[PDB]
Ligand binder design. Structure first.
Ligand SMILES: Cc1cc2nc3c(=O)[nH]c(=O)nc-3n(C[C@H](O)[C@H](O)[C@H](O)COP(=O)(O)OP(=O)(O)OC[C@H]3O[C@@H](n4cnc5c(N)ncnc54)[C@H](O)[C@@H]3O)c2cc1C
Ligand SMILES: NC(=O)c1ccc[n+]([C@@H]2O[C@H](COP(=O)([O-])OP(=O)(O)OC[C@H]3O[C@@H](n4cnc5c(N)ncnc54)[C@H](OP(=O)(O)O)[C@@H]3O)[C@@H](O)[C@H]2O)c1
Length: 531
């Protein structure tokens, strides 16, 4: 049961909300959180599909705000499984008694600024009404599942699942004819797991995404002990990087090197595994010819992975630059296609027409299935905010202001909507980074800002409209220096039909972006109106 007035409300109980709750307490503030879900964890609470695993390594993908948590906690594998990560979150939440500051089972529905009192009044599906000086939107980047644009979906007789709203109690596909739609990270992760239990597996792929080997391994518990001795320092280094990790920044250009050098250099990445390949060369995301050279190498690796060249060629990604859809880490995925019971249905030759109660109809045949798994992604970046009637000055709706794409200052706030902050979302580095580094800066930067308003006894913080536009024009200016906006991905909005095709994410580098937020805060929050 939620308090009637509060200094700051936080929506979302994943990494972001939890940390905001922790830190606002530290700074002597009344703070409370509302979360749709039954318990903490966010993505790692929702995404229980089998195979679910982080793609940034354990030693990197973690909170660094607590010397205690760094020293105590023991990660076991190169990449944490979803259960491992959920325990981690449960551990941190227990350590600081965080639930006491959280309402669960509660979806927020509407929020509305009030010029009279400079406060947000905020409503829920339980009928709660809450009044606050600030509202922190920590409701995520990949949180509202999206479903494919297909008729007959409610007719399917068998069992229907989305990977981001997966059952809490494990599913049995034993001896079933199972189908998966979507071959993004989710579809690539969950598929080899089902391949192992199902009688026959049908993988319905549209556009092939580029995937490289994870090469998971046990963590050497002595390497973890040396590291722990300099943990704070290790992390501080990851903060001083474009991507938030120790990924080496290749100084050279993909074009300047010989064919022989390109192969040997990319081969040492392919053997090691992980996503560091993205930065093998300075200009992979800057030059069509550079990219193409890297893209081809990866393409051949794929062809050598599958025995049936016909089926191999169907997996090769075509028509978009390498890296401009999110890069996926695979484990035994392409190898899966060698098994008698695994079938790759290519929806580009043969588009899906409809879901029948027996299964899936493409243009060429019909497929019969006991279960259909939807690994079709999310209403990315804007989706969770959009489900919420957010109204600010002049009764202006958030949804409409942003219909031509997100409009923000530093991604952190928007003109016409004072006292409102978005954690790790459009206009900022957000997902183009180890999201934990993205999430800490933002929680800190916002929370420092709230602390600053109270000490100086102010009550109203708004983005100057000119700066907001200056910023937005800046984000698209740099986006267009790269290869990013030239491909239909969730970054653009291209998976939600009708959504405006614009690249939603800052591309300058976490490092660069964070020194801008620092100068800003340093000059007393330049580009804001404070009263
Ligand atoms: C399957 C998956 C795996 C991931 N893998 C990686 C990875 O490899 N590396 C990486 O850096 N990042 C990864 N990400 C990105 C991920 O978003 C971040 O890593 C991070 O977990 C985000 O945490 P968060 O607190 O910002 O939001 P989330 O974890 O997304 O939490 C948002 C919460 O807000 C709640 N919520 C939303 N709207 C409302 C509202 N109306 N009312 C009440 N509650 C609401 C949701 O239920 C959810 O619990 C992954 C994402 C997914 C989907
Ligand atoms: N290992 C990890 O670290 C991990 C795991 C899961 C998620 N994530 C994060 O969250 C993002 C989501 O990954 P995701 O796989 O869940 O979602 P996604 O990347 O958006 O994948 C969408 C997939 O579903 C397909 N699809 C969507 N609509 C379709 C339709 N109407 N008909 C047929 N196919 C359709 C897409 O094909 P098209 O390409 O042709 O659109 C693609 O194959 C990831 O990129 C990453 O940022 C990370």
């Amino acid at each position: 049961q939620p308090p009637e007035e509060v200094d700051v409300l936080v929506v979302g109980a994943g990494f972001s909300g939890l940390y905001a709750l922790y830190r606002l307490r530290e700074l002597g503030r009344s703070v409370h959180v509302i979360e749709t879900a039954g318990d903490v964890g966010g993505v790692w609470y929702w995404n229980r599909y089998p195979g679910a695993r982080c793609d940034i390594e354990s030693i990197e993908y973690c909170y660094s705000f607590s010397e205690e948590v760094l020293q105590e906690w023991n990660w076991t594998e190169r990449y944490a499984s979803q259960p491992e990560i959920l325990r981690y979150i449960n551990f941190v939440a227990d350590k600081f008694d965080l639930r006491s500051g959280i309402t669960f089972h509660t979806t927020v529905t509407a929020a509305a600024f009030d010029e009279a009192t400079n406060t947000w009044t905020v409503d829920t599906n339980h009928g709660d009404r809450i009044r606050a000086r600030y509202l922190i939107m920590a409701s995520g980047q990949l949180s509202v599942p999206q479903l494919p644009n297909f008729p007959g979906l409610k007719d399917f007789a068998g069992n229907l699942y989305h990977t981001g709203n997966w059952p809490h109690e494990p599913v049995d596909f034993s001896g079933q004819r199972v189908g998966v739609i979507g071959t993004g990270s989710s579809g690539i992760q969950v598929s080899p797991q089902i391949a192992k239990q199902a009688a026959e597996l049908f993988v319905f792929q549209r556009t092939p995404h580029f995937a490289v080997p994870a090469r998971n391994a046990p963590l050497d518990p002595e390497f973890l002990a040396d590291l722990k001795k300099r943990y704070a320092e290790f992390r501080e280094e990851s903060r001083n990087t474009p991507g938030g990790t120790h990924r080496y920044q290749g100084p050279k250009s993909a074009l300047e090197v010989s064919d022989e050098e390109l192969v040997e250099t990319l081969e040492r990445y392919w053997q090691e595994g992980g996503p560091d390949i993205l930065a093998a060369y300075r200009d992979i995301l800057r030059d069509r010819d550079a990219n193409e050279r890297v893209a081809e190498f990866i393409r051949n690796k794929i062809r050598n992975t599958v025995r049936d060249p016909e089926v191999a060629e169907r997996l090769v990604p075509k028509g978009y630059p390498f890296g401009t859809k999110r890069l996926i880490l695979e484990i035994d995925y392409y190898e899966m296609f060698n098994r008698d019971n695994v079938h790759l249905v290519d929806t580009l030759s043969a588009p899906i027409e409809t879901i029948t109660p027996r299964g899936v109809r493409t243009s060429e045949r019909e497929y019969e299935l006991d279960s259909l798994v939807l690994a079709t992604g999310f209403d990315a970046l804007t989706g969770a905010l959009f489900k919420i009637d957010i109204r600010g000055v002049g009764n202006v709706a958030l949804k409409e202001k942003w219909a031509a794409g997100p409009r923000t200052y530093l991604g952190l706030s928007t003109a016409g909507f004072p006292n409102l902050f978005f954690i790790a979302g459009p206009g900022s580095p957000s997902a183009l980074s180890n999201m934990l580094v993205s999430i800490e800066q933002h929680v800190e930067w916002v929370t420092d800002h709230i602390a600053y308003m109270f000490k100086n006894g102010l009550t109203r913080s708004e983005a100057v409209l000119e700066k907001e536009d200056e910023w937005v024009e800046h984000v698209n200016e740099i986006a267009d220096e790269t290869l990013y906006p030239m491909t239909a991905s969730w970054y653009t909005g291209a998976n939600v039909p009708g959504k405006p095709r614009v690249f939603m994410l800052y591309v300058g580098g976490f490092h660069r972006y964070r020194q801008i937020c620092d100068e800003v805060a340093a000059k007393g929050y330049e580009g804001f109106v404070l009263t």
